[PDB]
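Lecture 7, part 2: worked example. A protein chain together with beta-D-glucopyranose.
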Amino acid sequence: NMMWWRGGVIYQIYPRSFLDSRGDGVGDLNGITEKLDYVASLNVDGIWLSPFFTSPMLDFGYDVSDYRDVDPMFGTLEDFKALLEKAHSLGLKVMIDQVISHTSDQHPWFQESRQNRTNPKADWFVWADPKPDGTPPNNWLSIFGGSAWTFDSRRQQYYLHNFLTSQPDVNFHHPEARQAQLDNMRFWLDLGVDGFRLNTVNFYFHDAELRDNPPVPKGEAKTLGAPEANPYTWQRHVYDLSRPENLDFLKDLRALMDEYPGTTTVGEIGDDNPLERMAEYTAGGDKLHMAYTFDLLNMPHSASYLREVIERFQRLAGDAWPCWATSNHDVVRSATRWGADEDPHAYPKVMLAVLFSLRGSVCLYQGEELGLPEADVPFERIQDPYGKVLWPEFKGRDGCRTPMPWTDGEQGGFSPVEPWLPMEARHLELAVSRQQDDPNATLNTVRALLAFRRSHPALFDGDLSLVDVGDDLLGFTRQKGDETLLCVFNLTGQEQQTTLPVEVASDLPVAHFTATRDGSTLTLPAYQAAFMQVA
Ligand SMILES: OC[C@H]1O[C@@H](O)[C@H](O)[C@@H](O)[C@@H]1O
Ligand SMILES: [Mg+2]
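Predicted complex, written out as structure tokens:
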């Protein structure tokens, strides 16, 4: 079963906010270990762990100072081995983050690199002389504010950083650095990890000519990976990322993965044309296994929009393979971002049904299975530095990083002390304990939907074909071998009706969904889904 990843569902855990088992108010590995039974009960195929490596935590894990160890705040390496072993014992695959695009400035490589222009690791990072006027070498901007270049007095040069100043980008034009990062991945592969989520996978290479980016002409759409309030979105990003050379490196990376059968990779795409880039990076079977984009991580969410996304993707390379996600640690929770103007109890069910019925892999964010709304984090409680640069137009990512509601008790049973982010009040009555034995609650809807998905080959990796189901409905067929299923979704809060584009063999009941099939006319109540066998 070495193709488990091609259609499998992965449960993303944000370590800081899952479960605190030691008592410092911050989630740790042992808590995850304690809740692997819960995770397994979701009928998901595996997990993706956000960074838990040694880090100053200035970007909370994504500024890595030691690629081959666990930060004391999350526990130890042995703790991780225990977590991995128990997870394997439950039939769960374990994937972990890899942030090889950039390191913390506290990483030994950079500490050495910054001292002078001639040291062994001087070229392991991206250094450039200032312009004659002492200004940055080009117009590249940091996503987290300011120029992408920061001056260092030691070398009298600027160093590049797409994100924080404390996150210098690695110079992938230096083969030994590439190799060092590959080795860093190999370290974790040798420990038995089942795969990697590749942080900003298209960022790896930059234009060595350091050419200026062109601006986006007024009225054209901005990039999906950043809020429009961010000046980052004022230029087309062609030279600061997504270079051709990266393809070659991807092959190398894939080669490493090939040395360990059954392992996989999912790339995070941050690009002006995310679908196209995902196709490019996941094509050939010699590069990325799969990748996800921000197309379903933004504001549009109509059935017509989904149709546009699916159509657009189907026009790309057919050998490509997508991973779909409606929520993660970087965006507003799906129940709020998409379903703010919808029923808070009904909409997450049909949304997640759509997510689970799309052709591709799935990323399911912690709490999304509870239909958790975006939390309101007060100014004085803000932790994410990305929330302190564009306030209040953009308030950062803390809203989706609030602690997991296990019980409706004190601090949601997350911690015996005050957690690093405040527990959201509204989450308490949506807690796991309050929701576990409720068959009408979103959790069990998710369980049933994923078991249902698991019982049908067509919903694993079957082909997808859009069909006419009306303007206010989303409809398509999934086909593999004997089995052809018709999937119809009502994402609206109003009853909808359509003529069936194919012939139904039998109705398929799943997760207490209600739909009326009268001959050739199908009716769907508000926020309902319909699955059917096709003759
Ligand atoms: O590390 C810089 C940023 O890169 C993004 O791709 C990650 O998903 C974020 O969590 C992180 O803050
Ligand atoms: Mg702890």
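The chain is about 25% helix and 15% strand. The chain has three domains: 1-103+175-462, 104-174, 463-535. Keep this in mind for problem set question 3.
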